[PDB]
RNA sequence: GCCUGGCGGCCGUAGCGCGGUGGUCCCACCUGACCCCAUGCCGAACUCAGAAGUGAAACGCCGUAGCGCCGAUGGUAGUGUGGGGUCUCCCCAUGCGAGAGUAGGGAACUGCCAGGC
RNA sequence: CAACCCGAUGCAAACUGCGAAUACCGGAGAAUGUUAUCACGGGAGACACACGGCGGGUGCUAACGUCCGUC
RNA sequence: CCUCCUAAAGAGUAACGGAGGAGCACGAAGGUUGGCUAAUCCUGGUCGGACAUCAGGAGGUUAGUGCAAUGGCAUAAGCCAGCUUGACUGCGAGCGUGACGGCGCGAGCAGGUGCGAAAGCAGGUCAUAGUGAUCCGGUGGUUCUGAAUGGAAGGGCCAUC
């Protein structure tokens with residue numbers, strides 16, 4: 001399963017993030033969508049979230065997962081996780097080669113204000 | 117994709133009824149030709165390897181992958197590394213275009229070909245037959261080559277059974293033997 | 295053995311140097327790799343290595 | 345005749361069984377030649393070259409068993 | 424005339440027994456010999472008994488040997504000082520304990536099997552007895 | 560509450576097999592590929608722009624106990640202190656008491672966020 | 677002639693998909709114990725042990741044998 | 748000197764007890780980033796047969812690990828590649844282990860490196876063998892000392908043979 005492979009790729013840093021116990025910003029990707037969420041250290045409860053699967057964002061969006069489209073997703077979780085008083089977090093490309101959409105959005109949340 | 121379209125057209129449906137399939141997304145699709153040609157030898161010459169490669173580089177529009185050993189525990193010789201082959205699978209377009217290249221001009225350019233194996237298949241439903249000798253087909257020149265050639269070719273289809281493997285190719289122009 | 299000792303000298307005028315071994319029997323190329331020079335308290339290019 | 349010889353002491357074992365005073369970095373377990381026998385977890389980690397279960401910040405020792413496939417794992421919560 | 428074809432090690436420690444074996448009841452024939460006593464068979468005894476066993480049943484029936492030597496057991500030469508390296512494997516013993524199942528018969532009348540294992544225990548250190556198949 | 564995805568708890572009574580099953584929500588394949596990026600050959604994988612189609616594969620469910628796995632009560636082995644018989648072994652008092660096997664269990668349970676009905 | 681595999685049966689100091697007693701380490705508590713404990717300093721002697729019990733190597737599960745652990 | 752058993756489930760224990768190894772090797776076989784994952788069997792394939800390369804299926808750490816054995820390893824330590832020099836200098840909370848000399852583990856701090864988008868990782872190698880105290884000298888550095896004074900010889904200190 002091509003999925004089972006991507007998992008182990010991130011199972012590494014995903015453990016490193018645990019090691020430091022830092023609020024990580026997970027970012028799952030899919031052919032038709034781009035998700036995002038800032039889970040707490042305990043890795044059980046998520047503090048914030050913003051994915052293209054939400055009308056509010058989808059509307060203003062042309063096509064879900066179009067880079068410039070998979071960007072606002074980040075800019076969203078960014079402020080969304082800032083008005084929450086959240087800042088300075090760790091990014092977890094969750095196995096996704098930091099280069100495409102995941103590469104973006106990160107700069108979005110980065111530019112938006114998020115510290116990472 | 118010339119033959120590629122034919123699949124979606126004549127084929128697919130032919131199987132959809134003959135094999136009575138329920139979903140068009142089931143019909144045994146053609147999953148890339150592989151091509152290998154385990155030249156081997158090397159030691160003696162070592163240059164015939166890149167030769168068998170350049171030859172494949174012609175037979176196919178892609179770049180040959182001069183493979184190495186693996187077990188090393190070979191009577192012949194071989195020590196972990198050491199060149200010994202050049203698989204070179206097929207790429208979608210080039211693949212079908214190839215499936216066209218042969219069966220229409222390769223298999224046709226015989227030596228005495230009086231039928232093709234109807235059991236070169238596997239258990240899953242994939243066929244793989246050796247040409248016995250490179251028919252000199254559209255390769256870097258003809259009478260300009262070297263000591264024979266020969267090689268192997270495998271289709272490998274999503275066929276859930278060797279039987280279904282027969283349907284495929286059969287819907288195409290696989291000469292076969294009957 | 296066959297592993298002679300080498301003395302990586304600093305490119306700087308400082309007489310500081312590092313020590314290690316090398317197998318000149320197969321690695322004739324004089325080794326260099328840059329290290330820290332305590333004297334100048336700044337990294338630099340160390341040389342000398344059979 | 346050949347038969348004889350043998351290594352020396354080479355202690356290696358648990359020197360901080362269960363909760364302890366756990367100073368800035370006692371040992372908790374120096375059972376070298378391991379990673380799974382004792383895994384670096386919690387406030388404690390390190391796991392020096394010789395696979396020695398470090399043990400950071402002062403506190404008590406836990407000695408647990410988590411994650412897929414047994415896996416001992418040691419750590420030092422607060423006291 | 425029955426020893427292991429291979430052994431990862433040449434010598435085994437002296438050690439000792441602790442009664443009660445595992446092969447309590449028969450599970451191949453329907454009779455066989457029982458332990459009753461703790462000991463060890465020089466492997467040569469098990470064969471010496473087997474021969475007497477076989478050559479009595481004439482041929483009829485089948486036989487089994489749930490016991491095996493596998494144990495080295497060394498010996499030190501005569502006129503030779505002490506403590507100078509472990510002795511040399513002279514024979515092979517088969518550690519057995521009470522309840523141990525030595526042999527087993529089936530294709531032969533119990534009247535024979537019985538009067539056959541007797542002509543066997545005659546060539547054995549441990550005091551054995553007779554046993555049946557038993558439904559359980 | 561029904562279904563789905565992301566992240567964890569706990570790690571086999573949570574797994575495997577076999578049968579059934581879900582869809583253009585989600586996911587999956589899937590399309591296209593000059594390009595971003597990628598192939599020691601391949602757009603297979605990674606990567607991007609995205610139809611048309613289908614749940615086929617995978618995945619997720621549901622059922623099923625054939626293979627795992629959990630697993631007593633009782634008895635058995637061992638053993639600490641005290642005593643006893645004794646050829647290297649064992650017995651008694653009294654605390655602790657397995658392993659295997661049997662009865663049986665068993666086709667996971669559970670939290671956070673999000674999206675569909 | 678036979679390995680591999682399958683079911684039924686055993687063996688292991690240098691086998692373990694299980695697993696005690698128990699020793700040991702740490703925490704809390706009562707009682708008892710002329711501090712039994714730890715540290716430093718003046719004086720030492722002693723580094724040939726022996727037997728018996730238990731767990732063992734070795735020896736022949738021989739020796740008022742031999743080499744360890746422990747009482 | 749290292750490994751396993753002996754060794755009675757902490758450490759440690761003896762024998763002219765039972766079995767093996769070390770006196771090195773690597774400028775990459777170190778560092779980091781990125782990616783990969785076997786052995787073996789079955790089946791089907793030009794020369795390819797017991798045993799090369801290829802395709803699938805079963806299989807699942809039975810492979811591999813620079814060299815013994817034990818423990819470990821998939822987040823791989825196992826494998827491939829890019830770029831590199833942290834096999835850096837000064838220190839070091841706190842521990843482990845020794846009669847001692849001494850040996851080992853070590854987060855964190857200061858200066859400068861490297862690799863990465865980043866979190867972060869790197870003070871040599873998966874770890875445990877690969878070793879020789881002192882003295883007497885050799886070499887480089889240093890304005891420490893230098894027998895009336897200025898130098899110098901010599902001495903000290905640091906690096907090293």
Ligand SMILES: [Mg+2]
Pocket residue numbers: none
């Ligand atoms: Mg003990």
Ligand SMILES: [Mg+2]
Pocket residue numbers: 723
């Ligand atoms: Mg003395």
Ligand SMILES: [Mg+2]
Pocket residue numbers: none
């Ligand atoms: Mg003495």
Ligand SMILES: [Mg+2]
Pocket residue numbers: none
């Ligand atoms: Mg004594």
Ligand SMILES: [Mg+2]
Pocket residue numbers: none
């Ligand atoms: Mg005596």
Ligand SMILES: [Mg+2]
Pocket residue numbers: none
């Ligand atoms: Mg011990």
Ligand SMILES: [Mg+2]
Pocket residue numbers: none
């Ligand atoms: Mg073959």
Ligand SMILES: [Mg+2]
Pocket residue numbers: none
């Ligand atoms: Mg090593």
